Design a protein around this ligand. Structure first.
Ligand SMILES: Nc1ncnc2c1ncn2[C@@H]1O[C@H](COP(=O)(O)OP(=O)(O)O)[C@@H](O)[C@H]1O
Ligand SMILES: [Mg+2]
Lengths: 464, 86, 56, 73, 593, 459
């Protein structure tokens, strides 16, 4: 049946290297290493008995520069013992991972057993063959109008959630997980916290438990107290689990990677620990590739019924799109959901500013077959009129309300009744995409039929 | 009137056709210039033949003297170490 | 033992050190090539009169 | 009034087309005139190079003769 | 065969490897990872491998191929997808039965099992043949018919034996050349080093426009067949969709869509949609995919392979140019190629220069963009191909001051800059009409005079209207609209109409997916005529508010001209535009009276 | 008579190569290495490439390869030390030929039948042997001749940006450069083939290939020959202007590309960078290039150097334009804003400057009012720009009567005076009359920078 067992029944001795040439920052350098690998995750034993894992990063002749995830602190040349496993970091995966809470490095903190591995998969993964990919054309009804109508999330989409520090991005992401469902017919959530607060992790865990998603969710929690070097591997572990459960098990998976800003801060700390290129704002020049190896593990593949949707939750430092984390994440991912501090202060939930938001995979996955015919034109017209509303609001602020034209007044009314009634939703209110489109048509019927220039004439005649 | 303007422009378009004929004549003049340049190419070649006739003559008059200098130099004993080596 | 090509080389030697890493092509053909590339002003001055334009 | 303006506009376009063709005809004559002049100069320079290489081709024959004479080689 | 001394990131310093030339292809590791030598520090030779370096051990053998990174040119590639080092992704998928690319898989770049119908060319036995001469042709597919088999450059001699007409694989001999007493056997394919550009007889000045189909790109900032192009802009601006629409609807005979640092779902979207799309060329409906090949290198693929993908794509474009086909290579992101270069340079330890990008980045970009250009192929029979490079630079932070963007603008001739303020609010194409420029208008004046004489004057009028209304928009944003004169109001209204209807072109609607050259010309004529009619009516003394109230129907008819189906044919739609202009003139005359 | 030319010096073929790094080739064992020496790297493929010795250790010689190091092996590569710096073969017939980046023929013609071998670096001209130019060149462009004059022997660059018509402006200046015939030495450093073809076509159409020498190093050409092309072109110009007594106008283009080549060589040498990675000695290298322009006391003949430059982002503060302004005298600023507005030439006369204008302009050389008219134009243009900024920031009515008159003057100045079609060839006197017509907009009272006598004699 399965021949992967035969290679498993092999014992490989590991060399214990007491020869530690030196240590600096998070990098511990070994000497007299016999044929070092390039990513051999080692088991570095401290003088006090603590065992920290580390993986080599640069291997000159008879030398290996190990970085330890838990930190060098306490490492001594005379007493530390480093054993080379001989293979890269491999997460023990199985179908029983669903319903278990793991630490940052995959060690189970659910007070339960060690995961009874069905396979050992490298956390770094491999690029999915573009010929083997399938373009995601199956719309997900997230239940929130700002994401279903204005934007649109497919099944294989990797649309993240751009947000600031204090915004309710966590409540939006938990809303999406508790409401995600195919428009025209469950999601095994894989949640990866990186440097989140205890309050955030507790909120996510309690939300999953109360909504019943905990029976099909595998948390990889890396709190702020957890070491800042294993934030690099936590999304890799969670995404390897998601890739398993999706491709090799045929389960649709929501991957929620919280605090990708914290992941990128860990990446910048690791890079600055070395003599890496500073990129922009101190982040490594390889940041794009690293974030690519994170995000691009999503998508569907040919012949396998599983799929992975990645909803990374970013934390923009100054609510700036131009910052490297949001810029690189927008360049890689297939859209973004822009949570706005302006709308949050205005009191709107969800505080989604749809103008910076986008979804590449709306183009296909919305249309006549997936949903009703008018959706694309309605979304385009809504974007145009929302922008006209914001511009007319700025013009009103500058030059008073009297100078505005009839079009500007209509657009201000549309802006008010669009932010107040369309974007705004309850935390537990889910709207069918057709209901959202009907509300959108009410908002467009605010206007006369002539000003809806982005609507095709046939759609406008059939839907006005 | 618009109709009268088109008729007047059509009358001026006849001059444009004459101008087009003048433009065609200019193209023919350019072809004649190229043809004349082709004749001038023979004239330039004839002028070049006059100059390079001396080039063949100037070479043969002083060829054997230059070879004597070239031969005596290639073979001349030039044995001297580098100044720094001393 | 590896002698120079009879057709290309007319005379001279190619002296090299013991390691054969540093060699000096002293063949008459190579020396004539150096003379041809380095005595063009003198050959031009001998063949043709000095240019009237080139003062100084 | 409109007829005069249209006729004048068409006449102006006629002059521009003739002027543009005249400029192209004049420049193309200059290009060919310079090219023939350039080819002639490269014709005498190459001949001088042939004249120069004629001397060098002989010295190679003369150098081979010197090598054959063991008295001076 | 040398060993491995260091493996740090994507670079692998290989010891005991004396004799390896620069940019020589090597096979690093036991899995035979393809790599290129950068530095040679004595015995050591730093190697940038084009695969993942995980699992490499010190001591693993490194073989020296003795050849540079060489693309494989011939029948086969036309309709395929590659992997930068030119590994066919379809063949990889069939051979591995897995959705991942295996490390160090060595599948042939061109399928050898397929037999191609070869028709010998005009060259016969005994006739002298030179580099780039066409000695035959094969039937690649329905669209690329008579895929002319070119004798490799730098190869000359006398044809001793030429194969007759029939079906041949790529391994079979097709032609034999004797040169200086040495026989050379030539097949349907031949390898060419990607770094060295393919020779041409003489590069020519590009004079025919590259019809992108986008209204703004075709009219305001045109590009020629053989001209470099740049599309800077932040994420979501529309560079990828502009590139895909250009590949779908351009008049270029061949498309080389290169994906460097671009998400793989875009490659999947191309592979899924292009077969569905059809090209009206060749006299029959043939799928777009029959004339498009993809050099796909996803962002998560090896870093060093982005440069290989760029060079492979441009060399395929140069080969199809040497065949005489007007090609247009499309780099997904030269900025992602430059980021890969920066990563390699930082791994090496070189001086960061500007923003960390290596000091040779400008020179590398200049060479890559100078690969493009209309040129006469190297050998007889005489033919004139071209290669346009439409490369989408993606600046970091959305600022056009990035080093890659500045170097790209220094080398290129067309700037299709993208504004994110227009990317939002769904105003695609988001071409920033202010900063955008095109230096090919002067050379395209000849084509415009030949086909659409009023195209340059209408385009200049549109540019003037947009610039004047931008100034008036600054004025109105500062001090309100009360100060503006009537003609200022018409200028602002007409420019808003142009931006909303003409410039704004939805690439995913049936009507505006492809606005041809004649439709774009008719739409400029309609909009400019509307501006002129409003100006004349207001100068006659009519109040602009009342005139707009009366001619709202004409304005809506003008704005709705973008919905006219290009599929109806040039004759039918142009009649509709003429009727629209006539009714517009009648309505404006009635309103004025 | 140079009888020392008839001498053969055998050269040392070193097969000891190592450390081949980027543009740099390192030789382990060299017998008495010479600094700034030319070597000939014979590749295993058989092709040879010249190289310059950048630095010498006790037995090492860090060589930079002009044609690039792509394909240089460490085993089969033989490096032959010529024994002297790079000497271009110069001649009077060298005029009218097209050369590669390394002074090699491109026009399918013979190698230069050398009249003398001149060193690329030249020799340092005695400052006491120089002549202050004081001889205006009627460049035919209004915005240049009238307000930033060019003197025969002045190194005045054309500061521009990417996409601006700097090539067109420089070609116009070269085409129409009579004094109030010129030989031309054109050096193309990394310019695209379209620009090179434009320059060659314009020279041929104007009739300049009879008296010009193009050193075309295209973009596809190797990126280290941009270091050597300006030096070859400038020593060709020095020959043609000092020994053959001609008047040479050098048009070195893409000095920004030259500086990028310098930074590439500097980065490979792992030396102390300087500003923006450009080598700390970029001032010295740019001065060595630029300062080869001017007139000498004994010899009547000059190099009117006009090095075209491209600002990376239209910024003067960038190291290349800043150092070029430091060394080269004057600057012609091509403005992106003016080009976007559609003006040709898009020369911004506020940053544009000419140090030698005050001495080469006026007092009977051209006309009595040239300097005062150009001061008045500059002052009123600055007033117009300030008034336009004030009218944009605040209400238009807040601007004074002088500010409104200056806005009108600025409009009539950019649109009529600076705006000059190609091939127009405005005389300096005609440009001065047009500038006065612009200055007659103002009442005589507020033309403050005009000397009262000239104001009375020309208003
Ligand atoms: N011409 C167009 N018509 C319709 N939509 C477009 C057009 N151009 C871009 N878009 C939209 O912009 C979104 C972002 O894609 P794009 O910006 O091209 O990717 P990139 O960020 O690589 O430039 C897509 O979802 C697409 O729907
Ligand atoms: Mg993209």
């Amino acid at each position: 049946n399965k021949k992967a067992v035969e290679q498993g029944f092999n014992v490989k001795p590991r060399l214990n290297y007491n020869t530690v040439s030196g240590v600096n920052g998070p990098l511990v350098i070994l000497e007299k290493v016999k044929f070092p690998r390039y990513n051999e995750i080692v088991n570095l034993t401290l003088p006090d008995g603590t065992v920290r894992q580390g993986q080599v990063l640069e291997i000159r002749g008879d030398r290996a520069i190990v970085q330890v995830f838990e930190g060098t602190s306490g490492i001594d040349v005379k007493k530390t013992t480093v054993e080379f496993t001989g293979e890269s970091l491999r997460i023990p995966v199985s179908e029983d991972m669903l319903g278990r809470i793991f630490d940052g490095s995959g060690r189970p903190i659910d007070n339960g057993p060690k995961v009874f591995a069905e396979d050992y998969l490298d956390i770094n993964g491999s690029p999915i063959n573009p010929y083997a990919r399938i373009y995601p054309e199956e719309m997900i009804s997230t239940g929130v109008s700002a994401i279903d109508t204005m934007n649109s999330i497919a099944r294989g989409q990797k649309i993240p959630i751009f947000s600031a520090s204090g915004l309710p991005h966590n409540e939006i992401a938990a809303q999406i997980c508790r409401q995600a469902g195919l428009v025209r017919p469950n999601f095994s959530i894989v949640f990866a916290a990186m440097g989140v607060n205890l309050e955030t992790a507790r909120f996510f865990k309690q939300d999953f438990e109360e909504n019943g998603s905990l029976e099909r969710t595998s948390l990889f929690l890396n709190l702020a107290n957890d070491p800042t070097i294993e934030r690099i591997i936590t999304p890799r572990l969670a995404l390897t689990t998601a890739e398993y459960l999706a491709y090799q098990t045929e389960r649709h998976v929501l991957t929620i990677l919280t605090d990708m800003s914290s992941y990128a801060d860990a990446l910048r700390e690791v890079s600055a620990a070395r003599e890496e290129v500073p990129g922009r704002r101190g982040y490594p020049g390889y940041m794009y590739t690293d974030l690519s190896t994170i995000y691009e593990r999503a998508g569907r593949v040919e012949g396998r019924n599983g799929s992975i949707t990645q909803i990374p939750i970013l934390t923009m430092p100054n609510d700036d799109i131009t910052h490297p984390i949001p810029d690189l994440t927008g360049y890689i991912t297939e859209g973004q959901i822009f949570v706005d501090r302006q709308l949050h202060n205005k009191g709107i939930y969800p505080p989604i500013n749809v103008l910076p938001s986008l979804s590449r995979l709306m183009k296909s996955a919305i249309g006549e077959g997936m949903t009703r015919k008018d959706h694309g034109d309605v979304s385009n017209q809504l974007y145009a009129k929302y922008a006209i509303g914001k511009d007319a609001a700025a013009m009103k602020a500058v030059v008073g309300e009297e100078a505005l034209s009839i079009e500007d007044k209509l657009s201000l009314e549309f802006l008010e009744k669009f932010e107040k009634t369309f974007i705004t939703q309850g935390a537990y209110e889910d709207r069918t995409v057709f209901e959202s489109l009907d509300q959108a048509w009410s908002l467009l019927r605010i206007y006369p039929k002539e000003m809806l220039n982005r609507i095709s004439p046939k759609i406008l005649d059939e839907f006005y | 009137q618009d109709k009268l303007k088109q008729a007047k422009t059509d009358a001026a378009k006849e001059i444009d056709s004459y101008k087009i004929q003048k433009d065609k004549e200019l193209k023919e003049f350019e072809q004649k210039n190229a043809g004349g340049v082709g004749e001038l190419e023979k004239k330039a070649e004839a002028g070049v033949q006059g100059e390079l006739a001396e080039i063949k003559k100037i070479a043969e008059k002083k060829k054997d003297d230059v070879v004597k200098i070239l031969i005596e130099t290639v073979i001349k004993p030039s044995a001297e170490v580098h100044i720094n080596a001393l | 033992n590896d002698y120079l090509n009879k057709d290309l080389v007319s005379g001279g030697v190619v002296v090299s050190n013991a390691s054969d890493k540093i060699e000096i092509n002293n063949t008459l053909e190579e020396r004539l090539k150096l003379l041809s590339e380095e005595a063009l002003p003198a050959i031009r001055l001998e063949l043709y009169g000095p240019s009237k334009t080139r003062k100084f | 009034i409109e007829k005069t303006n249209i006729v004048r506009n068409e006449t102006n376009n006629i002059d521009g087309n003739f002027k543009s063709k005249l400029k192209k005809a004049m420049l193309s004559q200059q290009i060919t005139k310079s090219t023939i002049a350039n080819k002639m100069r490269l014709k005498v320079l190459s001949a001088r190079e042939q004249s120069l290489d004629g001397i060098f081709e002989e010295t190679k024959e003369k150098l081979s003769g010197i090598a054959n004479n063991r008295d001076e080689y | 065969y040398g060993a491995i001394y260091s493996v740090s990131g994507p670079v692998v310093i290989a010891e005991n490897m004396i004799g390896c030339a620069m940019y020589e292809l090597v096979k690093v590791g036991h899995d035979n990872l393809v790599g290129e030598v950068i530095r040679i520090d004595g015995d050591k030779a730093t190697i940038q491998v084009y695969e993942e370096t995980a699992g490499l051990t010190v001591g693993d053998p490194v073989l020296r191929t003795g050849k540079p990174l060489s693309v494989e040119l011939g029948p086969g590639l036309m309709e395929t997808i590659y992997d930068g080092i030119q590994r066919p992704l379809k063949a990889i998928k069939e051979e591995s039965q897995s959705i991942y690319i295996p490390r160090g898989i060595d599948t042939p770049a061109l399928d050898r099992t397929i037999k191609w119908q070869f028709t010998p060319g005009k060259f016969q036995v005994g006739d002298h043949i030179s580099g780039g001469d066409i000695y035959g042709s094969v039937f690649e597919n329905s669209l690329i018919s008579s895929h002319k088999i070119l004798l490799p450059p730098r190869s000359r001699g006398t044809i001793t034996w030429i194969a007759p007409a029939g079906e041949y694989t790529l391994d079979e001999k097709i032609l034999e050349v004797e040169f200086d007493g040495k026989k050379s056997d030539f097949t349907l394919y031949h390898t060419w080093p990607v770094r060295v550009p393919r020779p041409v007889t003489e590069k020519l000045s590009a004079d025919y426009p590259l019809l992108t189909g986008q209204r703004v790109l075709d009219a305001l900032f045109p590009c020629v067949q053989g001209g470099t192009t740049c599309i800077p802009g932040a994420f979501g601006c529309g560079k990828t969709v502009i590139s895909q629409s250009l590949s779908k609807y351009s008049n270029s005979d061949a498309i080389i869509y290169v994906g460097c640092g671009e998400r793989g779902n875009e490659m999947a979207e191309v592979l899924m949609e292009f077969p569905e799309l059809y090209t009206e060329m060749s006299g029959t409906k043939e799928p777009i995919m029959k004339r498009t090949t993809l050099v796909a290198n996803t962002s998560n693929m090896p870093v060093a392979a982005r440069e290989a993908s760029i060079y492979t794509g441009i060399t395929l474009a140069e080969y199809f140019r040497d065949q005489g086909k007007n090609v247009s290579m499309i780099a997904d992101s030269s900025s992602r190629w430059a980021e890969a270069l920066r990563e390699i340079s930082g791994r090496l330890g070189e001086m960061p220069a500007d923003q960390g990008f290596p000091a040779y980045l400008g020179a590398k970009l200049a060479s890559f963009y100078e690969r493009a250009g209309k040129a006469v192929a190297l050998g007889s029979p005489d033919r004139t191909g071209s290669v346009s490079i439409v490369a989408a630079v993606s600046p970091a932070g959305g600022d056009f001051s990035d080093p890659v963007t500045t170097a790209t603008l220094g080398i290129t001739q067309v700037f299709w800059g993208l504004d994110k303020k227009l990317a939002q609010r769904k105003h695609f194409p988001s071409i920033n009409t202010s900063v955008s420029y095109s230096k090919y208008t002067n050379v395209l004046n000849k084509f415009y005079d030949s086909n659409y004489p009023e195209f340059p004057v209408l385009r200049d009028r549109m540019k003037e209207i947009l610039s004047n209304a931008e100034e008036l928009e600054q004025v109105v944003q500062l001090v309100g609209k009360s100060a503006l004169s009537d003609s200022d109001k018409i200028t602002l209204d007409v420019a808003t109409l142009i931006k909303e209807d003409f410039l704004q072109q939805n690439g995913y609607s049936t009507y505006d997916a492809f606005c041809p050259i004649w439709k774009t010309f008719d739409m400029m004529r309609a909009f400019i005529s509307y501006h002129d009619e409003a100006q004349k009516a207001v100068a006659n003394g009519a109040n602009w508010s009342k005139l707009a109230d009366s001619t709202g129907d004409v304005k809506h008819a003008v704005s709705s001209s973008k919905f006219f189906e290009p599929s109806r044919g040039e004759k039918e739609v142009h009649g509709e535009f003429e009727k629209l202009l006539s009714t517009m003139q009648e309505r404006f005359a009635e309103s004025t009276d």
